[PDB]
Symmetry: C2
Subunit: 224 residues, 2 copies
């Protein structure tokens, strides 16, 4: 079975019917690949399980020891949920043509020729490339994700939060996935800080969620 | 000098005034960098002297990093060249960041998309072999085997054929072994290139558009496989 130990999530399509999701999901399943309908989040522990307000960066979930390859499929680059998560996790976003090429070769070929742009940077006004650590035939996804420290690793972020609340949680989730620790508060309260995030309600300094996306698209700490 | 061991080519801007090229060219020179006005070709021999793939010139032993700078991806000849050689095409901000840090930083956060695939109908990523600080550009370029390494390609091509030569060059940079004859039809081969002439009737290998070369450049792969 070609897709043995591979996890797939499917994003978009961005443009109507640029690819047949259901057909491809079926082909993947029929070949030993697991399909995650909601996306890559099940690879990690739910940070919001405790409904806590001071959060540590994400840790790989037990179940991800069971796989060694992951991919998000997309007709082109986007800012949809599954896409950003993948960017956050350093999991390759690839063109559907990858799956078809795997079938054609009766194996899992190198995904690079099908590796989409990471996204469009408004700050830089260009499309950037994804930068993917190669899959090691030695590690499970659990090893890979455990050993990964994202571009925001170490950084301590204060997210100030007095429908819209879920939007905030998503930004927090991305910051955690990039390796930052995040404390959710209503005020700075004179707290020590590396960086402060608001949806836009005094010594860090401050920045909005677009900053997070730039970090996601560029896989860097752009405040640098 | 920060850029003492870096070679830079500059392309575009692609969009009017996206960046101040002359200002950037000046600052790189002021900071020790070599600027190649015509692009990256001077780093290799002149193959058009049925020659085999490109070899780096001894000159390139004197530098260990190279970049093509551009506001965004394009199909300009300098860009296409960088793609063929696996030299990073980066955003101008890269230079400003180096100045800011007083060192040559990781170019990675400034790594532009490789290009738009009309075949896949999407924008793809560049994939660059990391610069090993112990290796010169010569070592780097000598060790490289493009995605077209091995492929025998026939360029039937009987001022304007300069645009043609550009394609020939990219195939070689991609590591192909190329022979150029006005027409076939014996002959060897595993691929045939014609710039929309038509190509003779019967043939032993599929006919290909230059776009096929561009697709190989943008995806860094052998596409007909
Ligand atoms: Pr030196
Ligand atoms: Pr102009
Ligand atoms: Pr102008």
């Amino acid at each position: 079975l070609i897709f043995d130990d591979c996890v797939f999530a499917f994003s978009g399509p961005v443009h109507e019917d640029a690819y047949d999701r259901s057909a491809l999901e079926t082909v993947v399943q029929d070949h030993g690949g697991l399909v995650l309908d909601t996306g890559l989040r099940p690879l990690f522990n739910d940070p919001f399980k405790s409904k806590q307000k001071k959060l540590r960066h994400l840790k790989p979930q037990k179940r991800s020891k069971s796989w060694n390859q992951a991919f998000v499929v997309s007709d082109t680059f986007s800012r949809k949920v599954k896409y950003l998560e993948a960017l956050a996790f350093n999991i390759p976003c690839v063109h559907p043509q990858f799956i078809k090429q795997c079938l054609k070769m009766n194996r899992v070929v190198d995904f690079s020729p099908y590796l989409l742009a990471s996204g469009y940077s408004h700050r830089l006004d260009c499309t950037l490339s994804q930068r993917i650590e190669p899959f090691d035939t030695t590690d499970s996804l659990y090893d890979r994700l455990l050993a990964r420290k994202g571009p925001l690793f170490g950084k301590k972020i204060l997210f100030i939060i007095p429908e819209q609340g879920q939007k905030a949680l998503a930004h927090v989730y991305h910051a955690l996935a990039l390796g930052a620790d995040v404390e959710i508060r209503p005020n700075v309260a004179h707290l020590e800080c590396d960086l402060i995030l608001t949806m836009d309600g005094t010594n860090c300094p401050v920045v909005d969620p677009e900053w997070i996306v730039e970090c996601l698209i560029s896989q860097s700490d752009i405040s640098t």
